[PDB]
Amino acid sequence: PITKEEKQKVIQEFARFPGDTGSTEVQVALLTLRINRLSEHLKVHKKDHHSHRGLLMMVGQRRRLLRYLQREDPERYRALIEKLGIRG
Amino acid sequence: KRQVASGRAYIHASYNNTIVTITDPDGNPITWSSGGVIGYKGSRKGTPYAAQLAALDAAKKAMAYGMQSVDVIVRGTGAGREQAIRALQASGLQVKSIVDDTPVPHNGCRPKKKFRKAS
Amino acid sequence: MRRYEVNIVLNPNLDQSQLALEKEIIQRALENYGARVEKVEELGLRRLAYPIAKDPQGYFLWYQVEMPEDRVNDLARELRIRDNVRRVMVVKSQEPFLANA
Amino acid sequence: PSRKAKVKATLGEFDLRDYRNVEVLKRFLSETGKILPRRRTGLSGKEQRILAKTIKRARILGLLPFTEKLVRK
RNA sequence: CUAGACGGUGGGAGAGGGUGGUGGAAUUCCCGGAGUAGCGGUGAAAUGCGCAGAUACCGGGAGGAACGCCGAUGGCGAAGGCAGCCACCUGGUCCACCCGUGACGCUGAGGCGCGAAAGCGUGGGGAGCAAACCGGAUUAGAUACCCGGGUAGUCCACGCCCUAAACGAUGCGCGCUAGGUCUCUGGCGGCUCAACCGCUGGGGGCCGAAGCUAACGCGUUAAGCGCGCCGCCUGGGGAGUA
Numbered sequence: 001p002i003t004k005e006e007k008q009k010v011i012q013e014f015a016r017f018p019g020d021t022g023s024t025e026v027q028v029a030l031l032t033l034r035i036n037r038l039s040e041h042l043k044v045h046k047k048d049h050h051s052h053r054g055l056l057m058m059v060g061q062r063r064r065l066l067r068y069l070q071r072e073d074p075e076r077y078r079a080l081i082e083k084l085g086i087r088g
Numbered sequence: 089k090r091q092v093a094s095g096r097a098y099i100h101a102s103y104n105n106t107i108v109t110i111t112d113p114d115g116n117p118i119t120w121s122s123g124g125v126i127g128y129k130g131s132r133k134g135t136p137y138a139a140q141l142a143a144l145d146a147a148k149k150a151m152a153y154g155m156q157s158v159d160v161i162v163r164g165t166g167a168g169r170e171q172a173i174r175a176l177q178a179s180g181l182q183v184k185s186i187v188d189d190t191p192v193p194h195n196g197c198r199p200k201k202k203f204r205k206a207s
Numbered sequence: 208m209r210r211y212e213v214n215i216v217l218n219p220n221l222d223q224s225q226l227a228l229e230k231e232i233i234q235r236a237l238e239n240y241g242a243r244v245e246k247v248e249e250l251g252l253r254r255l256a257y258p259i260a261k262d263p264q265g266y267f268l269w270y271q272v273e274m275p276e277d278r279v280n281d282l283a284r285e286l287r288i289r290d291n292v293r294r295v296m297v298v299k300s301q302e303p304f305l306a307n308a
Numbered sequence: 309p310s311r312k313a314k315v316k317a318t319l320g321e322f323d324l325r326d327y328r329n330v331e332v333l334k335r336f337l338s339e340t341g342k343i344l345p346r347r348r349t350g351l352s353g354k355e356q357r358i359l360a361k362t363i364k365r366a367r368i369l370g371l372l373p374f375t376e377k378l379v380r381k
Numbered sequence: 382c383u384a385g386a387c388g389g390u391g392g393g394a395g396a397g398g399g400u401g402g403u404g405g406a407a408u409u410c411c412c413g414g415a416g417u418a419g420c421g422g423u424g425a426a427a428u429g430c431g432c433a434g435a436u437a438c439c440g441g442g443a444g445g446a447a448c449g450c451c452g453a454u455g456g457c458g459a460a461g462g463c464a465g466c467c468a469c470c471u472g473g474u475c476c477a478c479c480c481g482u483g484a485c486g487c488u489g490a491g492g493c494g495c496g497a498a499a500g501c502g503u504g505g506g507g508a509g510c511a512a513a514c515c516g517g518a519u520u521a522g523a524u525a526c527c528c529g530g531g532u533a534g535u536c537c538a539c540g541c542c543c544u545a546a547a548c549g550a551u552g553c554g555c556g557c558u559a560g561g562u563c564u565c566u567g568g569c570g571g572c573u574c575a576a577c578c579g580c581u582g583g584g585g586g587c588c589g590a591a592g593c594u595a596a597c598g599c600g601u602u603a604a605g606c607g608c609g610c611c612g613c614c615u616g617g618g619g620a621g622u623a
Contacts, residue, residue: 001470004390011389015481022388022481030388041399041471049495050398050458054472056494065387068485100437104422107437115439116415122436124419131425163437188381193407195447198510198535202528211468214369253330256341256373257405265370269328280401280468287403295403296369297468301325306355308321308575317576342450353455353565354394360451361466367404368466374405375450 002033014083024065025080031062032084091154092118097146097176097183099162101169106139108146108172110155118153121145136168143175151180160186209276209299210245212269213237215286216294219252219264226266229291233268240282241274260293271300314350324351324358327365333372336363341373 007030011021014029038055042048066086069077081087095118096111107122121142123133132138147155158181160173177183198204217229237244248269255265274282279297286295315335322332336349336359343349343363346356366372 007389020481021390022483024387024482024485027388027482027485038471045399045470048399048471051470051472052398053459053495054398057473061387065482065485072485096438098437102421105420107420109416109437111415111438114415117438118416120417120419120437122419125417131423161438186381188378191407192449193447194405194449195407197408197446197508199408200510200528204510216370250328253371255370256367257370259370276469278469283468284402294369296365296466298327298365299468303323304325304358306322306324306351307316307319338450340450345451345453353453354567356451357394357456357566363451364466374465 002037006033024069025076028062028065028069028080028086029084031058031065032086034058035062089153090118093154093156095150095155095158097158097160097181099143099160099169099172099176101139101162101164101166101172103134103166105133106142106166106168106172108143108176110146110150110158118155119146119149121149134167136171139168139172140175143172144179147176147179147181155181157182157184159184162186162188163190165190208241208243208273209279210271210273211279212271212298212300213242213282213286214294214296214298215268215270215292216259216265217268217289218260218291218293219262219266221266221291225291229289230268232289233270233286236282236285237270237272237274240278240285242270242272242282243274245271245273247271262293265293310347312348315344315348316350316355324355325362327362327369328371330366330371333359333363333366337372339376340378341367341375 010029010033011026014023014026015021016023016025020026035055035058038051038058042052042055045051066077066080069080092112094113096113096115098109098111100107100109105123107120107125109117109120111117123135123138123142126138126141126145128135128138147158150158158176160176160183162169162173173183173186215233217226221229234244236242250267250269252264252266255263259265283295283297286292319332319335322329327333336344336351338344343360346352349356349359351359363372367374
């Protein structure tokens with residue numbers, strides 16, 4: 001699982017400013033975190049399909065927030081990606 | 089011809105026949121009776137009357153080995169199982185206790201068609 | 208780490224020594240897995256509702272620990288290895304849900 | 309009718325989560341190892357649901373029975 | 382920008398999923414013990430089993446499969462579907478605070494994925510059950526129903542198949558339109574506490590306003606009043622065939 005520590009560490013590491021909890025950057029970060037763990041869990045447990053839907057959704061909600069980033073600030077976007085290391 | 093006195097009586101009821109087996113304080117049978125042991129051959133074998141006769145036959149014969157007191161153990165349900173538990177109480181033997189120990193699975197083997205259509 | 212509750216039921220026929228030896232391996236085992244013994248209780252002997260290993264009684268050990276969940280499963284594999292150990296139940300500690308109060 | 313007495317009322321303030329209180333737990337069992345219905349346990353859907361896990365945990369440990377024989381009949 | 386949506390902090394319930402572990406009941410078989418003449422089975426029977434000793438009973442062992450009570454009128458899941466306990470890994474979801482982002486939305490042809498049983502391929506397993514099959518009986522005949530056996534299969538793994546009273550016979554989202562009653566799960570609140578009660582949120586049922594409907598019935602879990610998008614019908618058979 002992801003400890004509160006593990007969590008806030010990412011939240012503060014992405015926040016746009018002191019106290020930023022829901023910036024697109026943050027959200028995307030937290031989702032990238034959950035995804036990876038799940039993608040991991042799933043490298044083993046290739047049968048746990050039920051959890052896999054959960055992933056399809058995380059990946060979904062993420063690629064959809066990112067889509068929103070370009071549209072708005074095309075810079076923060078390229079910025080977030082490079083950082084998080086999304087795409088591939 | 090051993091002279092036991094105190095023992096067990098197993099009543100095995102079923103919808104086809106009743107068979108009583110008397111035993112010593114720890115399980116080994118002394119004598120046994122059934123619907124067949126006595127007259128009855130087919131359907132008659134089940135009927136409570138037979139159960140009765142068989143119960144008695146069981147006790148009487150066991151009276152020989154000097155039986156007196158017995159613990160009754162009922163297994164299964166069927167054509168007159170209670171009659172057997174009665175013929176005993178009266179047979180002469182002092183019945184110390186009646187106990188239902190009819191086996192039941194915690195769901196193990198698929199039963200034959202005849203006993204399925206359930207769940 | 209997470210706070211747990213280890214239960215252990217072992218043979219009620221151990222002599223002062225034999226017993227203290229099994230407890231040895233336990234305490235030893237616990238550390239080997241990160242078990243930080245927060246406390247303990249020892250109701251000892253108790254008349255089981257049904258026989259366990261033919262024996263109608265049992266000796267009880269209760270330890271409330273704190274350890275790396277990623278090993279709690281091993282901790283018990285280990286605890287079950289003993290021959291005198293005839294029961295091992297590790298449980299996540301939980302706030303006492305009161306009732307009729 | 310089932311109006312003899314609610315096991316809950318006929319008792320004190322206990323921790324439904326405690327799987328070792330053979331003393332109290334044993335109270336919610338039929339004349340067999342069976343767990344009594346709410347009709348008789350006087351517990352609520354939620355309470356009664358927590359009892360079950362506790363009564364079951366207690367069964368594994370050997371403190372509580374799984375099933376007992378019936379006397380009389 | 383915050384009324385939608387998403388996020389944060391904090392509470393919560395659950396047979397949601399995956400891996401490993403772990404128990405007892407019962408069936409079958411095997412071993413030991415103890416005991417005779419039948420057991421079994423049916424509407425009656427017979428086949429069958431039993432004196433190489435069966436049947437019921439006690440103890441020991443091996444193996445496979447499933448997991449009473451609780452259990453519900455209950456819960457979970459998108460559906461198919463899902464019910465010992467333990468740990469690990471993991472999905473969804475509700476509530477409180479209103480703290481952060483600031484329309485980041487809805488639907489969704491094709492695609493991709495999931496999708497009971499039976500069935501297929503390789504290997505394993507096989508306790509019980511059981512297509513085919515082998516017998517017994519019933520019958521005018523019995524290629525059936527009933528009874529005794531029994532292979533595939535059912536169980537596991539890996540791959541394939543992709544179907545169905547898969548039903549609430551009620552495509553997805555959103556908004557709007559009396560109540561009453563029972564129920565599962567959360568809440569904060571009222572009486573000095575509690576017991577008791579409140580209303581309030583999510584879910585499951587019943588009855589019913591307005592309304593709808595051919596009728597039956599539906600009735601905030603719509604089949605009502607509206608909007609968006611998808612799929613589908615046009616008559617029946619031929620045919621889900623060529």
